[PDB]
Design a binder for this molecule. Structure first.
Ligand SMILES: Cc1cn([C@H]2C[C@H](O)[C@@H](COP(=O)(O)OP(=O)(O)O[C@H]3O[C@@H](C)[C@H](O)[C@@H](O)[C@H]3O)O2)c(=O)[nH]c1=O
Ligand SMILES: Cc1cn([C@H]2C[C@H](O)[C@@H](COP(=O)(O)OP(=O)(O)O[C@H]3O[C@@H](C)[C@H](O)[C@@H](O)[C@H]3O)O2)c(=O)[nH]c1=O
Ligand SMILES: Cc1cn([C@H]2C[C@H](O)[C@@H](COP(=O)(O)OP(=O)(O)O[C@H]3O[C@H](C)[C@H](O)[C@H](O)[C@H]3O)O2)c(=O)[nH]c1=O
Ligand SMILES: Cc1cn([C@H]2C[C@H](O)[C@@H](COP(=O)(O)OP(=O)(O)O[C@H]3O[C@H](C)[C@H](O)[C@H](O)[C@H]3O)O2)c(=O)[nH]c1=O
Lengths: 448, 448
């Protein structure tokens, strides 16, 4: 039995859910209380601890890599990157070494969807992670690397998914500054079954999620990544680049740099000092590796990575003949698999550039940091994955560009719909850009 | 000025060219003579030579890697692969070390197109390569890694291409058994300019190329790779998997293996012996590294890689509700960037399996090797890139599967149109499958 190649398009159902803020389970204004109710339901204290007091983690002796004795979860290893300016690369030349998080197994980031009263809802999970600054945020229905579990609720809907019910299934990369070539499987799958409901789960329409997306530190990094992959229909199907032209532009960005990376032992990393409490850069930039104990009120100890300052991640937006475009950058990070990924107009931790002249600041940073309320279309503070990162936060913005811009090398005007289409594939849209696409789609569905 | 996202579709022009065998420059039956005329035009002798007699190549002392003293062209290094069966990978367990070709710079494989008498033609190049078994085959208009040239004819049409004239621009990977993560930029670009014509170039319609594609050792590996990317319109837009279902199936294949690879010094490779003339495997499988001198009648010396036997590469085909599907395999090779790529139903050098029991032969090999003329839809012998490979040939087949098959794990029925659509992106379709897609598209346009 063959079917049409575009069989079972969910675009109309997705649209109806995004337009609806009346959900079956909970009023949107009550979710904040529900989260607090879940946070209070078992108190966790996360305390920073010397590395020596890590329980089942150690620095293994030959490599000095920070590893869990069972061989599960992740490792902290070393990375050496060179970008050449020579031939076969445009440069400029860059070279550095750093600690890096490694985790070779693809994990599942799965959102279960089901219709109630004729409107799709999505089963969000109130999930405690040790590095969440507010402890509990809303994660996907299933957020798990399977072999980290000797028992994950609802995992069977994603392992394998029913192929008749897949809305989204794609691998997408995570932060290329701090993880070495990490991607997880982003999935949205429908069911008609009665689904068991545990206290930590709430069915929400996409319109309820769109409102919640404007709130700080509420919808977690993994939820924003998976929701960014939703295949909306394009309402304005024109763009400055045709889709082939955009693929060609990006092909040239991925071909024009000469980046060589190698994984090295953590003990070999130059420029970083390993103390009794932290591994930190010698000039206090970038991030630190630290250790925490997690106690309930169940317990464990683990490394986490913390950044040195609040980050700034922004898209500049311009309407071109009436069609909104965002200015992407084809960014070259050390942990990327295929040299480049598209990223927001500005993506940086500003302190990392404070030592350099104003003209080596990230392009457009000044413009974003000093923008008027009137040009700010979206602003919120979101944090990164709390299983690996301790309180790593950034101001995520969408700002109208007050005047035309000639994009500098490495930048291009692309529509959000073109970004939505590329999320069918991996290594095109980076995690920060995926978060801002989820924010743009939320602002469109439920504006404030 | 925005344009429609699907602006400037070339599908009707491509179709008209594929239907036309009356070309402006040459009758198709005369091309064989023209090639011989170009071969005779300057005779080259390629002779095998001991490694010692390599001129500007050496085994560098710390690594033992085979390198050109100028730092251009490619290197032969070592590779160590493990596939784990543990947990986080399906297995089975595999582990081996081998020499491998490395060349980090993306090269250009560019075909220039232009209308004559209202029909697109493509400017093919009669190109001598030292490893071509018959010396001269038809390559793309531009076939060059730019920094290997201190001066490449027509390169300016591809560097950068005119964005208003791009038909195809995409990176595609080469053999994952013998190259380490190598992709080149496959491009087809139109011009309305009068183009200079040198004696080694001939304008051909796509229908002329389709006829030439049925000939042995005529249209070279790089030309078949780039022509496989042509975006034909789908005449039958149904398939067993919807396009999302196919992406989901492939996502699970790319997530379910645990492959770890590292580049090592050639001197460290176990299981291979380096002699005065060849590096070869201790049990005489796989390939050898050898050295050749190339003399005109201009000269140089270089390594080449030769395989141990004629290869067999085949698609099995079945009509499913009237729609032809081919049985792809999601193949796991050591040089791939992203774990898997789709490959033909059968892709092997049979001698590499002669030591193992009949039940560890590649699935379907027996069926392909013993197929009836009546079930053979396409058969030809094609060789691989003659700049790196000495006489590496395989029988490329498309065969009707005499009965339904339940695909084994790692295999799936996909339509050729779905493969054509995935060639807009890299790392989905491997080079052997791209060659068979070009052959399927040739058999459809100009059947024999
Ligand atoms: C980590 C590191 C970086 N570098 C170089 C690499 C880069 O060229 C430059 C900036 O480093 P990056 O890690 O790319 O930081 P950045 O400030 O440019 O970007 C950051 O943006 C925040 C919004 C994100 O949350 C972070 O994950 C990161 O992407 O410094 C070093 O020289 N040494 C180092 O140890
Ligand atoms: C090279 C090598 C391979 N192996 C293992 C890896 C694979 O599991 C198995 C088969 O090796 P492969 O190189 O994949 O050979 P193969 O015979 O399976 O496939 C070949 O098909 C021909 C049509 C292509 O032209 C070749 O480039 C290659 O892909 O042997 C070793 O154990 N040692 C080695 O040195
Ligand atoms: C790190 C650690 C944990 N635990 C426990 C605590 C957790 O409850 C459980 C699993 O923990 P983790 O969430 O770290 O493992 P996963 O649920 O697999 O989540 C990871 O993978 C996902 C797919 C997402 O990417 C997620 O963001 C990522 O963190 O194991 C330890 O006992 N000791 C330890 O050292
Ligand atoms: C290898 C060698 C060559 N030459 C000369 C001979 C050639 O005429 C010229 C360039 O040669 P090559 O074709 O090897 O280099 P490219 O034209 O860059 O072709 C390579 O890259 C392409 C994009 C295609 O992938 C092609 O298949 C691939 O081979 O340089 C040497 O003088 N000494 C030597 O060691």
């Amino acid at each position: 039995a063959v079917r049409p190649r575009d069989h079972h398009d969910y675009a109309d159902r997705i649209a109806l859910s995004a337009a609806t803020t009346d959900g079956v389970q909970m009023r949107t204004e009550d979710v904040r209380a529900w989260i607090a109710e879940r946070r209070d339901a078992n108190v966790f204290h996360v305390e920073r601890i010397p590395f020596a007091d890590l329980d089942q983690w150690w620095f293994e002796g030959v490599t000095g890599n920070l590893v869990h004795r069972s061989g599960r979860f992740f490792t902290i290893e070393g990375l050496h990157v060179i970008e050449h300016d020579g031939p076969h690369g445009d440069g400029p030349y860059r070279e550095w070494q750093q600690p890096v998080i490694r985790q070779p197994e693809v994990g599942i980031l799965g959102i279960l969807a089901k219709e109630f009263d004729g409107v799709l809802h999505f089963l969000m999970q109130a999930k405690m992670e040790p590095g969440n600054p507010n402890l509990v945020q809303l994660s996907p229905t299933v957020q798990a690397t399977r072999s980290n579990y000797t028992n994950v609720k609802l995992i069977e809907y994603f392992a394998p998914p029913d192929p008749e019910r897949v809305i989204v299934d794609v691998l997408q990369a995570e932060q290329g500054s701090w993880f070495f070539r990490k991607s997880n499987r982003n999935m949205i799958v429908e069911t008609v079954d009665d689904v068991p409901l545990w206290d930590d789960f709430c069915w929400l329409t996409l319109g309820q999620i769109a409102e919640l997306m404007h709130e700080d530190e509420t919808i977690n990094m993994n939820s924003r990544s998976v929701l960014s992959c939703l295949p909306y229909q394009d309402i304005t199907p024109r763009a400055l680049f045709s889709d082939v032209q955009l693929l060609s532009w990006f092909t040239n960005e991925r071909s024009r740099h000469d980046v060589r990376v190698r994984r090295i032992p953590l003990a070999d990393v130059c420029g970083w000092k390993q103390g009794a409490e932290e591994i930190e850069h010698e000039d206090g930039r970038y991030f630190k590796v630290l250790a925490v104990a997690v106690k309930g009120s169940i317990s464990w100890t683990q490394p986490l990575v913390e950044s040195v300052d609040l980050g700034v991640v922004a898209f500049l937006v311009r309407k071109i003949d009436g069609v909104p475009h965002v200015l992407v950058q084809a960014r070259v990070d050390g942990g990327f698999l295929d040299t480049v990924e598209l990223a927001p107009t500005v993506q940086c931790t500003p302190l990392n550039y404070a030592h350099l002249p104003a003209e080596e600041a990230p392009p457009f940073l000044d413009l974003v940091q000093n923008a008027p309320r009137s040009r700010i279309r979206y602003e919120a503070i979101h944090s990164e994955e709390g299983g690996r990162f301790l309180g790593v936060r950034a101001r995520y913005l969408v700002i109208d560009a007050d005047e035309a811009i000639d994009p500098p090398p490495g930048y291009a005007w692309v529509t959000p719909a073109q970004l939505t289409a590329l999320t069918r594939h991996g290594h095109y849209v980076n995690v920060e850009a995926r978060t801002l696409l989820a924010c743009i789609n939320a602002a469109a569905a439920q504006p404030r």
